[PDB]
Amino acid sequence: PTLTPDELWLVMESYWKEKGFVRQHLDSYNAFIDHGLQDVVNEFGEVVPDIPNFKVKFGKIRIGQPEFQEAQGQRRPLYPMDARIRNLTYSAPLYLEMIPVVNGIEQEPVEVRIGELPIMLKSKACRLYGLSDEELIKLGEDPKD
Amino acid sequence: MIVPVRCFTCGKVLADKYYEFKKRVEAGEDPGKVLDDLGVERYCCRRTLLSHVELIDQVMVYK
Amino acid sequence: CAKCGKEVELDLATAREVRCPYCGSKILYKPRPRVARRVKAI
Amino acid sequence: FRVAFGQLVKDMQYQMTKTYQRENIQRFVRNSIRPDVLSERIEH
Ligand SMILES: [Zn+2]
């Protein structure tokens, strides 16, 4: 009979430690990666040409790992600290599978880049996802981030 | 950032009593008595050790 | 004349690009000069 | 991403239609998607 302030506080505090303190953008991004993204690409469907034989069907998109091609194109894995220090963009390539539909018949699915999508920090696709404080520290960040 | 060497208001040595303070309290011994067992007269000088944060144990692990 | 993320220095000049040829890292660090430095302790 | 990808699909539209009059068989695909488009419109 009666719960008192302190115990209720323990409840709240537990909610805080367990859930995210600012993961508002986070759940939303995590949902944008899986559920969304794929929607826009499954809605636009095909494409052109003005010549009616060819067609190209858009399949499903996958989000690569945060990497960057420096001088003369050289693909190297990227961490946030390297991005902030080099005036770079913490992003990963988006690879779409596309199906050449000639005369009605399908050729074969082909995996091709689409560009580069900026990754939100500590997200799912974000290289910092399931890392411990020591690994963040080894990276050059504080676990308080 | 490692105990403000000495003190601010009471400006005497206090850094030299950091470790044993912390470690003495890190067993359950109430700080308000631990301090008394050491050279901690006025509260002004006491505050400097009470409300310290030692952020350095984060900063070194860098450069 | 340099360093990067967790190791040792490099030599001077350049012609093609700049990554640490000892770490593969991309960032270089100019170490403080070992000369005399008077810091007026106020 | 919708609009940016739209610019991509459109530039690919112009691309495939215009780069044909230069009837491609082995047109395996797709050296004609200029990815920077999708990147730029999102970055900038
Ligand atoms: Zn004092």
XYZ file of C-alpha atoms and ligand atoms in Angstrom:
295
model
C 0.000 0.000 0.000
C 1.704 3.134 -1.469
C 4.629 3.169 -3.914
C 6.541 6.276 -2.745
C 8.621 8.688 -4.904
C 11.971 6.814 -4.938
C 10.594 3.571 -6.398
C 8.615 5.406 -9.093
C 11.864 7.184 -9.896
C 13.531 3.791 -10.268
C 10.817 2.956 -12.810
C 11.462 6.101 -14.873
C 15.261 5.811 -14.638
C 14.970 2.226 -15.859
C 12.955 3.477 -18.841
C 15.767 5.933 -19.563
C 18.749 3.597 -19.380
C 16.923 0.867 -21.279
C 15.296 2.940 -24.019
C 17.081 5.681 -25.935
C 17.589 9.169 -24.545
C 17.444 10.821 -27.967
C 16.739 7.805 -30.185
C 13.722 9.645 -31.625
C 15.530 10.212 -34.925
C 16.903 6.706 -34.462
C 13.784 4.512 -34.489
C 12.530 6.651 -37.362
C 15.720 6.100 -39.367
C 15.767 2.387 -38.536
C 12.244 2.249 -39.958
C 13.288 4.368 -42.974
C 16.004 1.843 -43.800
C 13.919 -1.347 -43.676
C 10.266 -0.462 -44.282
C 10.646 2.774 -46.241
C 13.255 3.441 -48.944
C 12.043 0.204 -50.547
C 8.598 1.778 -50.954
C 9.681 4.653 -53.192
C 11.693 2.231 -55.298
C 8.882 -0.314 -55.542
C 6.356 2.373 -56.477
C 8.181 4.014 -59.385
C 8.344 0.509 -60.831
C 10.113 0.575 -64.170
C 11.512 3.426 -66.239
C 11.801 4.188 -69.957
C 12.956 4.011 -73.094
C 11.103 5.983 -75.782
C 11.724 2.854 -77.831
C 9.164 0.351 -76.488
C 11.271 -2.851 -76.643
C 13.537 -2.413 -73.635
C 12.298 -1.860 -70.108
C 13.962 -1.983 -66.705
C 12.270 -3.357 -63.603
C 13.431 -2.051 -60.226
C 13.818 -4.787 -57.623
C 14.888 -4.204 -54.031
C 17.546 -1.891 -52.577
C 20.288 -2.866 -50.144
C 22.290 -0.438 -48.013
C 26.029 -1.069 -48.115
C 28.657 -0.336 -45.484
C 29.894 3.237 -44.814
C 32.804 3.638 -47.232
C 34.430 6.303 -49.380
C 36.490 6.380 -52.552
C 39.328 8.850 -52.093
C 41.637 10.037 -54.869
C 41.251 8.348 -58.272
C 38.636 6.029 -56.772
C 39.826 3.742 -53.984
C 37.145 2.144 -51.827
C 38.030 2.395 -48.129
C 35.846 1.768 -45.039
C 34.926 4.925 -43.104
C 34.209 5.706 -39.450
C 32.492 8.917 -38.213
C 35.683 10.429 -36.788
C 37.417 10.075 -40.160
C 34.439 11.809 -41.782
C 34.389 14.757 -39.378
C 38.151 15.167 -39.591
C 38.377 15.074 -43.404
C 35.295 17.127 -44.344
C 33.785 13.931 -45.746
C 30.234 12.579 -45.812
C 29.453 9.691 -43.457
C 27.505 7.679 -46.012
C 27.113 4.267 -47.647
C 26.387 3.171 -51.238
C 22.874 2.048 -52.160
C 22.849 -0.974 -54.443
C 19.699 -1.662 -56.457
C 18.970 -4.800 -58.448
C 17.621 -4.034 -61.906
C 16.049 -6.336 -64.489
C 16.465 -5.594 -68.228
C 13.104 -6.490 -69.782
C 13.584 -6.700 -73.554
C 10.602 -7.401 -75.837
C 8.695 -8.539 -72.747
C 11.192 -11.131 -71.520
C 13.520 -10.594 -68.563
C 17.296 -10.780 -68.957
C 18.714 -11.303 -65.462
C 18.885 -9.257 -62.236
C 21.952 -6.991 -62.090
C 23.292 -5.331 -58.921
C 24.343 -1.707 -59.441
C 25.078 1.340 -57.259
C 22.545 4.167 -57.145
C 24.624 6.797 -55.398
C 25.374 7.362 -51.742
C 23.063 7.762 -48.727
C 24.083 9.686 -45.570
C 24.014 7.410 -42.522
C 22.606 8.644 -39.205
C 24.971 8.051 -36.277
C 24.382 5.070 -33.984
C 21.684 3.841 -36.368
C 21.336 0.329 -37.725
C 23.472 0.852 -40.826
C 25.785 3.068 -38.765
C 29.152 1.399 -38.112
C 28.753 2.425 -34.442
C 25.646 0.251 -33.862
C 26.502 -2.612 -31.494
C 29.824 -1.397 -30.151
C 30.933 -1.233 -26.517
C 32.372 1.862 -24.825
C 35.925 0.584 -25.299
C 35.395 0.167 -29.042
C 33.915 3.665 -29.344
C 36.940 4.912 -27.419
C 39.240 3.000 -29.766
C 37.346 4.700 -32.580
C 37.922 8.168 -31.143
C 34.496 8.918 -29.710
C 33.075 9.128 -26.204
C 30.508 6.512 -25.087
C 28.434 9.466 -23.892
C 27.584 10.338 -27.502
C 40.064 16.996 -14.889
C 42.268 15.708 -12.011
C 41.452 17.355 -8.647
C 42.028 21.113 -8.810
C 45.549 21.068 -7.378
C 45.186 22.697 -3.968
C 41.927 24.568 -3.482
C 40.152 27.685 -4.752
C 38.772 29.648 -1.807
C 40.824 27.999 0.927
C 43.756 27.615 -1.483
C 45.685 24.938 0.415
C 46.903 21.476 -0.560
C 44.059 19.066 -1.322
C 45.121 17.102 -4.386
C 47.385 15.006 -2.160
C 44.291 13.736 -0.336
C 42.354 12.656 -3.416
C 43.045 8.935 -3.696
C 42.597 8.011 -0.028
C 39.428 10.123 0.104
C 37.798 8.351 -2.833
C 39.049 4.901 -1.849
C 37.902 5.399 1.751
C 34.394 6.279 0.567
C 34.500 3.446 -1.999
C 33.959 0.999 0.863
C 30.836 2.578 2.329
C 32.552 4.973 4.723
C 30.509 8.194 4.628
C 32.558 10.999 3.014
C 31.477 13.523 5.645
C 33.470 11.585 8.228
C 36.329 10.505 5.961
C 36.977 14.178 5.247
C 37.001 14.860 8.985
C 39.660 12.195 9.537
C 41.755 14.132 7.009
C 42.744 17.795 6.830
C 39.318 19.131 5.894
C 38.279 21.970 8.205
C 36.110 24.547 6.436
C 33.503 23.517 3.863
C 34.784 25.882 1.182
C 37.918 23.775 0.850
C 35.753 20.687 1.320
C 33.514 21.563 -1.636
C 36.438 21.458 -4.074
C 36.894 17.753 -3.290
C 33.214 16.910 -2.791
C 31.872 18.041 -6.150
C 34.820 17.077 -8.360
C 34.392 14.982 -11.516
C 37.818 13.710 -12.717
C 36.836 13.866 -16.404
C 40.441 13.042 -17.309
C 39.766 9.282 -17.167
C 38.033 9.880 -20.506
C 40.320 12.429 -22.164
C 43.662 10.593 -21.954
C 42.368 7.647 -23.986
C 42.874 9.893 -27.016
C 45.933 12.048 -27.699
C 57.229 14.986 -39.823
C 53.955 13.108 -39.344
C 51.967 10.327 -37.620
C 48.402 8.982 -37.752
C 45.976 6.902 -35.710
C 48.040 4.994 -33.102
C 51.695 4.640 -34.305
C 54.781 6.274 -35.853
C 56.062 9.228 -37.920
C 56.691 9.566 -41.653
C 59.191 11.345 -43.894
C 58.683 14.713 -45.591
C 57.623 15.438 -49.138
C 54.863 14.466 -51.565
C 53.919 13.957 -55.215
C 51.040 11.500 -55.382
C 48.376 11.669 -52.654
C 48.763 11.497 -48.870
C 48.074 8.453 -46.733
C 50.369 7.062 -44.040
C 52.482 4.372 -45.773
C 52.772 2.562 -42.438
C 49.165 2.397 -41.275
C 47.290 2.846 -44.545
C 45.585 5.626 -42.612
C 44.728 8.935 -44.252
C 45.278 11.464 -41.461
C 48.660 12.997 -40.625
C 49.766 14.630 -37.370
C 52.462 17.282 -36.989
C 54.133 16.512 -33.633
C 55.018 19.404 -31.322
C 58.557 20.727 -31.928
C 60.950 19.466 -29.248
C 62.559 22.913 -28.914
C 62.251 25.430 -26.064
C 58.785 26.575 -24.974
C 58.316 29.055 -22.127
C 54.805 28.895 -20.674
C 54.314 31.721 -18.187
C 52.672 29.930 -15.259
C 50.019 32.294 -13.955
C 15.016 10.352 -51.188
C 11.851 10.223 -53.277
C 12.604 13.404 -55.198
C 16.361 12.743 -55.442
C 15.758 9.233 -56.785
C 13.230 10.842 -59.110
C 15.980 13.033 -60.548
C 18.060 9.887 -60.953
C 15.337 7.909 -62.752
C 14.743 10.930 -64.994
C 18.419 11.440 -65.836
C 18.514 7.720 -66.615
C 15.456 8.341 -68.763
C 17.226 10.971 -70.840
C 20.370 8.833 -70.732
C 19.022 5.552 -72.118
C 16.835 7.265 -74.716
C 19.618 9.538 -75.976
C 22.529 7.097 -75.781
C 20.759 4.531 -77.976
C 21.001 6.370 -81.310
C 24.779 5.933 -81.064
C 20.508 0.107 -81.055
C 22.661 -1.690 -78.484
C 22.582 -5.498 -78.448
C 24.861 -6.798 -75.660
C 23.401 -3.803 -73.810
C 23.900 -5.881 -70.664
C 23.489 -2.669 -68.671
C 23.899 -0.072 -67.048
C 26.976 2.110 -67.644
C 24.526 5.000 -67.761
C 23.100 5.770 -64.303
C 25.374 8.693 -63.213
C 25.053 7.961 -59.455
C 26.300 11.389 -58.288
C 22.838 12.732 -59.112
C 21.147 10.845 -56.268
C 24.099 11.729 -54.071
C 24.255 15.452 -54.826
C 20.563 16.247 -54.408
C 20.704 14.545 -50.997
C 24.057 15.898 -49.834
C 23.685 19.544 -50.847
Zn 38.145 26.037 2.133
